[PDB]
Amino acid sequence: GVVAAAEKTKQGGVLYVGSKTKEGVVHGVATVAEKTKEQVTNVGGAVVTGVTAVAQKTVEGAGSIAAATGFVKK
Amino acid sequence: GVVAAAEKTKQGGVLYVGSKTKEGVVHGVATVAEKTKEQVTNVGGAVVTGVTAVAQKTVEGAGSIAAATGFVKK
Amino acid sequence: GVVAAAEKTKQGGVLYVGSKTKEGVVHGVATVAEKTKEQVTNVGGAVVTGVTAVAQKTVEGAGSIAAATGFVKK
Amino acid sequence: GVVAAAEKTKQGGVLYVGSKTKEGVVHGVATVAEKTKEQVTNVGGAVVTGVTAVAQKTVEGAGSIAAATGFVKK
Amino acid sequence: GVVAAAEKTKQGGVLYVGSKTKEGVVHGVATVAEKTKEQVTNVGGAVVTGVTAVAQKTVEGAGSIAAATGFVKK
Amino acid sequence: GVVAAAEKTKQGGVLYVGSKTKEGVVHGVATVAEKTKEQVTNVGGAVVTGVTAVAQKTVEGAGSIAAATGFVK
Amino acid sequence: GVVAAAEKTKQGGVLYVGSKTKEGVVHGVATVAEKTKEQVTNVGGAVVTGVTAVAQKTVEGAGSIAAATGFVK
Amino acid sequence: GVVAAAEKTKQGGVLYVGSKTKEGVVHGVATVAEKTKEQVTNVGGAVVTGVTAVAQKTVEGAGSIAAATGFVK
Amino acid sequence: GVVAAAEKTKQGGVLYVGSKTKEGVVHGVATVAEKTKEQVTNVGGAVVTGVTAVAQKTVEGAGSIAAATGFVK
Amino acid sequence: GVVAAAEKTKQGGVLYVGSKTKEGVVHGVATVAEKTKEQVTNVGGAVVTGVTAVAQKTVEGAGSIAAATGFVK
């Protein structure tokens, strides 16, 4: 049917951030709806959602997402 | 059949963040609805949703997500 | 048949975060609804949801999520 | 048949967080609803939900989640 | 029916967190509903939900969750 | 200094209130502060602070309030 | 000299309200502050602060308020 | 000399409201500040602060308010 | 100084309101500030701040307000 | 100084409102500011600030407001 496979087989500076905020409003991945049917949110990676957000060397391997929404098939 | 599979088999700087905020409002992954039917949220990775959020070497292997929603199939 | 499977078989630097907030409001993975049928939230990874959130070497292995919602099938 | 499986068979710096918060309000994985039928929350990983939340080397093995909700089949 | 299985067979820095809060309100994995039928919450990992939360080397093995809810099957 | 005087000398329908609440939260005359030096509240009248509040013919006479605060002299 | 004086000397229908609420939050006369010095609240009249608040023939006489705040000199 | 005086000397229909609320949030006379010095709220009349608020024949007399704030000199 | 005065002497119809709301947020006389010195709010009349607010024959006499703020001199 | 005065002496139709709201946000008299000195709000009349607001025969008498803000001298 719906298959997702991922494999990770292996034969194994300065980043300054200076901030100053006042009255910050932040939204990340958002899904606002009204009279819908499904609301699927699959996160395989990273979602950094700061007022001050820093990400370093974040996602290094084998992501796999398989989604199937609906399919009435009457 | 909804199948997910993940395998991780292995034969084995400075980051200053200076923050100063005042009245921050932060939302991460949000899902707002009225009169829906399913609300599926699968996180295979990382969701960092601070006012000051830092992620370092975060996700590094074998993420597998399989989602199948709805399917009336009458 | 909804199947997940994960295998992790293995044959085996300064992080300063200086913060100062005042009246911070933070929401992580949120799901708000009315008149729904299912609300599935599967976390195979990490959800860091601070005012000051730091994640380091967070997710390093064999994440498998298999979600199958709805399925009236008649 | 909803099956999960996981195996982890192994044949085997500085982290400074300085915080100062006044009146912080924090929510983690939240599921708010009215007139739902199921509310399933499976955590195979970590949910760190502080005002000052730090996670190091958090999830490193064989996470398996298999969820199957609804299924009227009538 | 609903089978889970997990096996873990093995044949073998500095953390400074300085916090200062005043009137911090913290929630974690929460599930709020009215007129619902099932409310299932399975934790196979860790939920750290302090005002100050630190989790080091948290989840290192063989997590397996298998959930099957609803199933009217008339 | 601070004088208040009040004299009252007297010589000689249908109310339907149908309410149906659920989880009501009510605050009346409120005063919230930090590091304040004085916090004075004088009520010469009526303070009706219900979830369902009905007031009829409440205050009919000689209210006198004399408030004098501070005076760091 | 802060003086308040009031005198009241007398030498002498259908009201239907129908309410149905759910999750009501109500604040009346509110005073929120930080690092203030005085917070004076004098009420000479009526403060009706319901979720369903009804006031009829409420205040009918001789209200006097005299407030004098601060005066560092 | 902050003076307030008031005198009231006297020598001798259908109202239907039908409401339906869900998740109502109401604030009346509100005063919000940070790092202020004085916060004076004198109410001589009526403050009706419902989700459903009805006021009939509310204030009919001799209201007198005298306010004097500050005056550093 | 600051003087007020008011005298009220006297020698003596269908109103249908049909309402239906959902998620109503209402504010009345509001005062929001940062680093102020005075915040004076005097009400000599009526402040009806409902979600469904009705006022009938509300204010009918002798309102007097005197206000004097500041005066650093 | 700052004086006020007011006197009210006297010697002795269907109105239908039908409303439907969903997600209504209403503000009345508002004063938003930062780093100011004074914030004065005197109400001598009526302030009706509903989602559905009706005011009938509201203010019929002798309003008087005197305000004097500042005057550094």
Residue numbers in the entry:
A (entry chain C), B (entry chain B), C (entry chain A), D (entry chain D), E (entry chain E): 14 to 25, 36 to 97
F (entry chain J), G (entry chain I), H (entry chain G), I (entry chain F), J (entry chain H): 14 to 25, 36 to 96
Question: What's written in the study?
Answer:
In metazoa, the combination of Hsc70 (the constitutively expressed human cytosolic Hsp70), DNAJB1 (a class B JDP), and Apg2 (NEF Hsp110) can disassemble αSyn, tau and huntingtin exon 1 amyloid fibrils by depolymerisation and fragmentation. Here, we use cryo-electron microscopy (cryo-EM) to investigate the structure of DNAJB1 in complex with αSyn amyloid fibrils. This reveals that DNAJB1 binds in a tightly packed array all along the fibrils with a 40 Å repeat.
As for WT DNAJB1, we performed single-particle analysis using the amyloid fibril reconstruction toolbox in RELION 3.1 to study ΔJ-DNAJB1 in complex with αSyn amyloid fibrils. We then generated a structure at 3.2 Å with a helical twist of -1.33° and a helical rise of 4.74 Å. This structure is different from the two forms shown in Supplementary Fig. 2, but similar to a reported structure with an additional density at the N-terminus displaying a hairpin-like shape (PDB: 6OSJ26). However, we could not assign the sequence for the additional hairpin because of a gap in the density. This pattern of binding was observed for both WT and ΔJ-DNAJB1 in independent experiments with different fibril conformers.
